Design an enzyme around this catalytic site. Structure first.
Site, PDB file in Angstrom:
ATOM      1  N   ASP A   1       0.825  -1.211   0.000  1.00 31.43           N
ATOM      2  CA  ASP A   1       0.000   0.000   0.000  1.00 31.43           C
ATOM      3  C   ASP A   1       0.862   1.265   0.000  1.00 31.43           C
ATOM      4  O   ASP A   1       1.927   1.312   0.628  1.00 31.43           O
ATOM      5  CB  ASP A   1      -0.926   0.037   1.234  1.00 31.43           C
ATOM      6  CG  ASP A   1      -0.161   0.012   2.547  1.00 31.43           C
ATOM      7  OD1 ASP A   1       0.693  -0.880   2.712  1.00 31.43           O
ATOM      8  OD2 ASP A   1      -0.447   0.857   3.427  1.00 31.43           O
ATOM      9  N   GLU A   2       0.361   2.297  -0.670  1.00 31.88           N
ATOM     10  CA  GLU A   2       0.885   3.654  -0.504  1.00 31.88           C
ATOM     11  C   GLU A   2       2.394   3.725  -0.712  1.00 31.88           C
ATOM     12  O   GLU A   2       3.120   4.373   0.048  1.00 31.88           O
ATOM     13  CB  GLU A   2       0.461   4.209   0.863  1.00 31.88           C
ATOM     14  CG  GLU A   2      -1.039   4.449   0.916  1.00 31.88           C
ATOM     15  CD  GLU A   2      -1.594   4.638   2.308  1.00 31.88           C
ATOM     16  OE1 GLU A   2      -0.867   4.429   3.300  1.00 31.88           O
ATOM     17  OE2 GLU A   2      -2.794   4.991   2.402  1.00 31.88           O
TER      18      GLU A   2
END
Ligand code: NAG
Length: 507
Positions: free
Chosen positions: A326-327
């Site tokens: 993620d991210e």
């Protein structure tokens, strides 16, 4: 016909505020007949499987049940390996289970003389035992002896099985650290609501929480802080094994996560060689996300990842390892594709399938055995996963239990809006993604703003009860008005368990 949605309860939460079973999640069927069973001091638990090995497993399950029943009744109920239960007995058996109910399903039939739980597998006997505890009077959940309550169960017939195979809870132990005891407690509480998976978010920007013997400074440096500054902490490999074992007794799979290539500042703060300039990053105690990255084109990165995966695989029996993904906003799309493919190859070489947050399914290195954890829940999320035949675990806003209940909640975030007990109930996994193989649901408890066990309790209860029912109970049988009233009725049970829940004003 006339319809409406729920507003806040006039004059405040019934959870303030307020013979009667309180089954949550709602079972496939529940009927009550005349008469009752009485649990007395002389009761035994009888167990019988299809062979001696299965009977031995049932015996352990029986002992777990006896312990719980003994704590509140003050009895000393013992467990007997026999298929000849005596009047007043609880009987747990896998002989003649209804195959249509699957591994986790069960029948639970209470007569005046006997409680009989019939399942296909020991796992189903365990799940059914969670229902049995909810059929006995409030007070049975107490961890100390309760007097003045007759321990009765109505004559009743229950059949049950889950809608989804994966019904999980994630705890973030990176942002704030929680002790082995605190973690075991959350696993135990969740298990009572038929949660069957526990995802540990063991590393992030603000801390690294798992001993890695080949890279000792992950602990010596990387574990020494957390959000807001202060001591942090970590689990030794022995402690992690202890957590796994404790979860296994509740038929809960533990899936460890080492988030990569983003959310890696703690690793980058531990080892300078993981950084382009060869210097350690300063530790981060703020709550920003997205800024950190491993070096996607340096072999030392993949050596590091392999060492971590080797050690974690050796101590984690789950066939899955979660590698995050993620991210990674400091990682180019090209480098992300490449990186996630490479680390999936490493994981697979150590006999583990990879779970990853979206957009990790888009990696050209994914296989049909990889799993997508779909948190974004946009129209395009999981397009790759679907095309590749990958299982999907959904974690929509409604499952982000770290969100404030209301604008004025004293703890929680709000980037996905507010999530009260109603919002945590009024959704379906097919809302998040269409046309997918939905493995199940995972409630995520991120810990940027949660420091104490009370904070965990407040945010998980009653929210997790809503998510647990979404995972277990079929959509056609879910109804907020029904659940709400059941939850009001269940409130004393939360109190009795010592859960410092939020008395949600919408209940
Ligand atoms: C997959 C994911 O959720 N990533 C971040 C997570 O690091 C953070 O703790 C959480 C708080 O709600 O918000 C997310 O954006």
């Amino acid at each position: 016909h006339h319809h409406h949605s729920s507003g806040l309860v006039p004059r405040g939460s019934h959870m303030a505020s307020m013979s009667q079973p309180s089954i949550l999640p709602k079972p496939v069927s529940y009927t009550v007949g005349s008469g009752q069973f009485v649990l007395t001091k002389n009761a035994s638990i009888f167990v019988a499987g299809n062979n001696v090995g299965e009977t031995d497993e049932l015996f352990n399950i029986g002992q777990a049940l006896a312990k719980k029943l003994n704590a509140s009744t003050g009895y000393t109920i013992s467990v007997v390996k026999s298929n000849q239960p005596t009047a007043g007995s609880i009987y747990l058996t896998t002989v003649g289970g209804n195959a249509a109910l699957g591994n986790e399903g069960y029948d639970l039939i209470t007569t005046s003389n006997q409680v009989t739980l019939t399942a296909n597998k020991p796992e189903g006997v365990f799940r059914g035992n969670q229902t049995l505890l909810q059929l006995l009077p409030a007070g049975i959940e107490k961890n100390t002896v309760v007097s003045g309550v007759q321990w009765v169960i109505p004559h009743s017939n229950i059949s049950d099985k889950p809608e989804y195979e994966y019904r999980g809870l994630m705890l973030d132990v990176a942002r704030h650290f929680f002790t082995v005891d605190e973690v075991k407690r959350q696993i135990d509480l969740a298990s009572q609501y038929k949660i069957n998976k526990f995802h540990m978010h063991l590393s992030d920007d603000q801390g690294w929480r798992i001993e890695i013997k080949s890279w000792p400074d992950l602990i010596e440096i990387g574990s020494k802080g957390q959000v807001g500054g202060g001591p942090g902490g970590y689990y030794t490999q022995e402690q992690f094994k202890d957590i796994v074992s404790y979860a296994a007794e509740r038929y809960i799979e533990v899936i460890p996560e080492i988030d990569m290539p983003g959310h890696t500042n703690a690793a980058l703060a531990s080892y300078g060689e993981l950084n382009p300039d060869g210097k350690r990053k300063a530790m981060r105690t703020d709550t920003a996300v997205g800024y950190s990255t491993l070096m996607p084109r340096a072999e030392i990165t993949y050596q590091f990842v392999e060492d971590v995966i080797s050690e974690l695989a050796a101590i984690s029996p789950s066939p899955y390892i979660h590698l995050g993904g993620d991210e990674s906003n400091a990682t180019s799309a090209a480098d992300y594709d490449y990186f996630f493919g490479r680390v999936t190859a490493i994981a697979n070489s150590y006999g583990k399938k990879v779970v990853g947050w979206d957009p990790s399914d888009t990696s050209s290195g994914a296989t049909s055995d990889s799993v997508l954890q779909n948190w974004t829940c946009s129209a395009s999320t999981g397009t790759a996963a679907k095309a590749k035949g990958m299982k999907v675990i959904v974690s929509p806003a409604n499952a982000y239990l770290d969100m404030k209940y209301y604008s004025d909640s004293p703890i929680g975030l709000q980037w996905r809006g507010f999530v009260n007990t109603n919002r945590a109930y009024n959704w379906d996994p097919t809302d998040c993604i269409k046309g997918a193989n939905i493995y199940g649901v995972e409630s995520t408890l991120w810990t940027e703003t949660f420091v104490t066990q009370d904070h965990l309790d407040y945010m998980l209860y009653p929210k997790l009860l809503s998510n647990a029912e979404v995972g277990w109970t079929a959509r056609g049988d879910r109804n907020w008005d029904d659940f709400k009233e059941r939850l009001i009725e269940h409130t004393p049970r939360l109190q009795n368990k010592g859960i410092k829940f939020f008395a949600d004003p919408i209940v």
